[PDB]
Amino acid sequence: SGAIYVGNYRVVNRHLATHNDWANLVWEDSSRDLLVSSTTAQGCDTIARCDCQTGVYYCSSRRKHYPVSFSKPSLIFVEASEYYPARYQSHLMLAVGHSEPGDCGGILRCQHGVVGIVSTGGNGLVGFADVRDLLWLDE
């Protein structure tokens, strides 16, 4: 689990969104595994606007942060799960690192701020849903 809080927005994994996230829906994209809902309180997370390929992520299944090199956002094939059939997920970045399904929502950060959230994994890989192109989150 885990979310990003920026201004009047809350970003979560679309497969983990709540009834309240859906009742206050701003934008959702199944192909990206992302959902943004509105909040009354003002968020203080800083979103990165960059093309960094190094950063640090939080892995709840180890209670640790890990430094990683990751690929640029791309269309990657993601095996089936209880939430989606087998499909290509867009705007996904991969790195060699530990992850388990319960790690979804753990934040990836570079020196400029929040890059994305854990969304996929397996076979010693971890995938992050990018958020750096969502310029509207800041305004």
Ligand X SMILES: NC(=O)[C@H]1CCC(=O)N(Cc2cccc3cc[nH]c23)C1
Does the annotation place 44 within a ligand binding site?
A: no
The Cα 122–Cα 18 span in angstroms is: 25
Which run of H or E residues covers position 74?
Answer: strand 74-78
Segment near ligand X (CB under 6 A); pick from 47-55, 66-74, 93-101, 105-113: 93-101
The answer to whether 15 contacts ligand X (rule: CB under 6 A) is yes
Token couple for 131: 């958020």
Active site residues: 15, 33, 104
Nearest residue to ligand X by CB is 121
The Cα 72–Cα 103 span in angstroms is: 21
Question: Which residues contribute to the annotated binding site for Zn(2+)?
Answer: 50, 52, 110, 112
Q: Which spans of this chain sit near Zn ion (rule: CB under 5 A)? A: 48, 50, 52, 110, 112
